[model samples]
Target: NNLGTELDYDTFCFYYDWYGSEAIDGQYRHWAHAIAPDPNGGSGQNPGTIPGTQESIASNFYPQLGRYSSSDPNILTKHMDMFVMARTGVLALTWWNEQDETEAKRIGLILDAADKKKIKVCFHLEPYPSRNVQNLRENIVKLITRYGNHPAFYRKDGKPLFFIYDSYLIEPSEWEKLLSPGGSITIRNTAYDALMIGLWTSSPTVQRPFILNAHFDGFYTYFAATGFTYGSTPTNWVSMQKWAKENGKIFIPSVGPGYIDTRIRPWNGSVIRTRTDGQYYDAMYRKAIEAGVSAISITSFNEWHEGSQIEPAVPYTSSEFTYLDYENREPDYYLTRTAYWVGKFRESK
Candidate 1:
């Protein structure tokens, strides 16, 4: 049951989403992401604006469990089992805001399930509507007060860790007011203080000013697509890691099996990163280990929209389209590969 305890040296976190479907919630939440027209205004083969249904969900790949709900305890338990199989010690659960009651409820369930497997759970603070510094602080306080005491809540060196998605939207001065120790409303040393890791979307040149000015404890490359952002490029990770070490900051480079969201964003075909029969994942993990990072983050465990999930998937042909599969490999191929890479990482250290 305590499988994750021995795998704590180099934290292996998976970005997890808590979504819903009609099977459990009587309606499709995230699985039914609306299809958008081609942004380039080209006469490409676009799906236009199709309403996603169970048979025609918005993903290039089909889940092995079909369009299931996140609140299903059985599904959650199965997910944790997969994590244990992969030797992934942490689950970076996505959080929208405090106003989402469904998400809040799902978080509690996820934490309880994760605790049963001795897996740690951290927050990936999504950029909610009208998000600002003050309300961000309030949300942190509320989250800590509510779930901070949970045994599954993840922490490093006694401080909880938070990954701020799209953190560059807010000005550094505004973040300084909360993250900087000398700022007027700083959270430094407070009970709400945490190890805030911001998203790095730009080149390495921008990392120093952004982290120092914004007072971020660390940075992470969240995007699975290579060349989409400088930070997401695996080749850039070695230099980034070196910079982080020289400055005494944490740097977690995120890797993924592949990237393909053509189902929802039909216009984004050129950016697709092919799975290459799991070779893509192996290469990405190899690069991360070569960077000599202290922690490694997976782009997702079940982000079916972008086709970055390591969760099991099955081949299926619907009336509209044919879903992609893991070629001849089994459904749990990625989980087994992850365990192999994790073992390599540990040996390198």
Candidate 2:
């Protein structure tokens, strides 16, 4: 086996919808906001539980985290514990802006929470209207100056790690202005330089060219539904891995417990994937291992809006509505299953 060079074989899970408060806010936020509008003005648009008109949650298990502020010590500690048990190495937090107020400010608290444990934190750089080379550079500088020294702030090869969501919106030329080795305002070899990973969610013909031109160190898909797109499917992993190797790029394929967005996208009922209790998740991991990728990423840790959350969801029912429960299985089934795969992955690697 090749030695000398370090291989980054790590597992990361996505975290999103990190706002709102059921305990404090009178209305829905973060985990709750997906409620269907009640035409009769009944129990609708509530935050915490499932909506009345929304059906098709994708997996056999239903997760309800309730609407809690992201900075709550109880919620933060609980989530960190879940990921620790799952053996996931990184928490890919979704960040929309530097000062959107809630989640942005809450990252500091999250950093402290992960520090208590031995977990890592990475940013999922979301596309914002103000995104560009200069602003991104500024963001990087600010983040490093404020929190880069924290032990929980993740770094790879001595550089901070950042995952860019919807990276294609910006042209390669634009990215070059910032990422190219010597472009104007370039971050290459600079204090703000980072290991940038882009989102290439499908096998679109433009993906290869896009990643190459965008100057990304790696690319991944966040969708949990298998066979949803050519890029997201397992079959494409092998070829993509080959391509990445040839291009000096890394391929971090994504898999998920299941997929469902009916509550958020009512017209998209046909786009659901069954979790099959836990077999589906197993199969996805198997494919990634076979693909020979350097790292693997999970779709989400708690994206309850689309029902792709692997977070423990209990069976809940109000007088007017009931939420889906795990298949008569313990709420921690997914967590335990993820641990199983992580152990297997380490052994075989």
Candidate 3:
């Protein structure tokens, strides 16, 4: 299983989706509440919620809502300290900043917030997938100008790291018309009228330009195999990775243990499937590293309900949380997989 006994996974990102609000009356404001924090009467894998409820990430929990920094700006500050700063190297600044009149400074401020905590930040812009380039660039520029050169900016060979959620065929021009019940493109797949590509609502089809312009420091080419049934096997994934590399793009492919959306949203399906899950994940991990990616970003550290969760959901003792095989059947998977490949990438331990 060890690619080389010398391997050690170093460059790790925790996908920190958790935050702690200041304790006002000796009562700690569970920041997850802002993101729909419903910590259950439980511990271990389900630390906040007492297992049995859908993991609380509602559609409206986006950072652009301005609630995270506004209600308790310190929540952002403390997350870097209590969790981010101490345990990791980089954070994907995993926020969904909307297209058209987006708050570009948000990524910059996140770095400022991280500065208070002394950790660094990288901007991961979530494009609408169907909006045109004019709309996407509209907000992307606002982002690059101010935060482009920050020390925390995710860079590749000295360029500021600006990422756009990318794919192909699904150009932005098409998204303007296809409206989801929620306004975001997460739900509706029917194509809009202008561009007239019926599959325009398709995920990969609309995400192209976002990648072409993504010429950022590094790009985490998001392959949402779960969002749709497109090309998913590591072979197809690696080939596309080669194209990105040939174009001088610094890239990393996302690998998840497995996904199960049914737990939370009955509407969810097995969209993002992996040929090699736990045991084979290490194989893909090594392959991605050999692909010469700047880094590898785990789809998550703990998105339990979406089914792509690495955290276990079963009941177990607190320490048993570490033993997640029975609960998630893959509990310590990410940690172990990380330990090996992160080390392989850096050639360190």
Q: Which residue segments of model 1 deviate by more than 4 Å?
A: 1-6, 42-50
Residue 101's lDDT within candidate 3 is 29
Instruction: Please give, for residues 219-297, the per-residue lDDT of candidate 2 as tens digits.
Output: 8877788777776888788898899889998778888887776655555656687778888888998888888877788
Candidate 1 per-residue lDDT, tens place, 76-155, comes to 99998888888898899888884767777789999999999998898889989999899999989998999999999988
- Cα displacement (angstroms), candidate 1, residue 178, comes to 1.2
Q: 1-349 in candidate 3: lDDT tens per residue?
A: 6444332122434343333223421222222332222234244433233221123332211121211232245555644443232234556555454432223444445677666644555555453545454554444455555566576654444433433444233443343322222334321232111101111112343333444432232345344243343333455456555655675544566655555433233333435354244654556556567666655666554444344434323433332122123233343445555555555677621
**TM-score head-to-head 1 vs 2, winner:** 1
Model 3: number of clashes?
A: 30
Give the C-alpha lDDT of model 2.
0.75
Task: Score residue 85 of candidate 3 by CA lDDT.
Answer: 20
Q: What is the C-alpha lDDT of each candidate?
A: 0.85, 0.75, 0.42
Off by over 4 Å in 3: 1-88, 98-119, 128-131, 145-151, 166-221, 224-231, 245-247, 267-269, 272-277, 292-294, 302-305, 309-333
Best by TM-score: 1
lDDT of 1: 0.85
Per-candidate TM-scores read 0.94, 0.87, 0.54
